[PDB]
Design a protein around this nucleic acid. Structure first.
Length: 257
DNA sequence: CCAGACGTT
DNA sequence: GTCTGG
DNA sequence: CCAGACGTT
DNA sequence: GTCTGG
């Protein structure tokens, strides 16, 4: 999973991230760096997407079940990385295989420090490789949804896709803001998706999964990794090739055909 | 020991 | 920074 | 992820 | 074929 849609206006996104802390207080997650939120139908690696993380990553003594929402760089840049510019990274951290995560230098260390985040999207795109043709068929893939008038109604009630991520913090040698960057954990595609692609993102389905993944305060790596697996609770439709070029940011990207 | 990699679809 | 391969 | 470049005097 | 930029 190397492309998402995350196009909602910031306040609509934030309201769609309404949740309950461990005490059952209804809350909206508190923003950091909201100016870096860049809505688009076509989010590629190296772009910023909003992710949820525990408040306790940002505030001493916080309730770890409280949530921050913050734009992060898609493509995990490890703390130790030595060059001036993130883009010089010579290995792909767009994704992080679940099967090998504990053996991977770039992911184990930040995972170990509790740096679990939830990557938000409308949904993700996958390109289907079909036998004996180089033509790839793009699909938009998303949580099942409630079953220009309809458009506004749909998107107000949209259930955002919640993907399990890991993030790391990098101080540019040259100097600047700390870079927060993320990888989306991958697992085997479910039966529903297996004729489209062998890989899918690790989807956290519902508030229990999202909560336990976020809460590095109360939930160990070993307990968190149990949430990482495929889900059949997923739907999709084929979309035009408009999505293919990551410069194309329009509704046509995720329109059915 | 040091050198060199650190990753995925 | 930390681990693997030599 | 795909698209597009891939080079020097 | 392989890497960078989006």
């Amino acid at each position: 999973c190397g492309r998402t849609s995350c196009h909602l206006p910031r306040d609509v996104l934030t309201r769609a991230c309404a949740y309950q802390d461990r005490r059952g207080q209804q809350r909206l997650p508190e923003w950091r760096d909201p100016d870096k939120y860049c809505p688009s139908y076509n989010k590629s690696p190296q772009s910023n997407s909003p992710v949820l993380l525990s408040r306790l990553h940002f505030e001493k003594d916080a309730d770890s079940s409280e949530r921050i929402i913050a734009p992060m760089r898609w493509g995990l840049v490890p703390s130790w990385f030595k060059e001036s510019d993130p883009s010089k990274l010579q290995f792909n951290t767009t994704n992080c295989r679940s099967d090998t995560v504990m053996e991977k230098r770039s992911f184990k260390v930040p995972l170990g420090k509790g740096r679990r985040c939830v990557v938000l999207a409308d949904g993700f795109y996958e390109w289907q490789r079909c036998q004996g043709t180089n033509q790839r068929q793009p699909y938009f893939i998303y949580f099942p949804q409630i079953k220009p008038e309809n458009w506004e109604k749909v998107w107000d009630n949209w259930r955002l896709l919640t993907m399990a991520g890991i993030f790391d913090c990098w101080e540019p040698p040259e100097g600047g803001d700390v870079l927060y960057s993320y990888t989306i954990i991958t697992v085997d595609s479910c039966k529903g998706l297996s004729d489209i692609h062998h890989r899918m993102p690790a989807i956290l389905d519902g508030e229990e999964a999202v909560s336990k993944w976020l809460d590095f305060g109360e939930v160990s790596t070993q307990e968190a990794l149990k949430l990482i697996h495929p889900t059949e609770n997923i739907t999709f439709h084929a979309v035009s090739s408009v999505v293919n070029n990551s410069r194309n940011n329009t509704p046509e990207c995720l329109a059915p055909v």
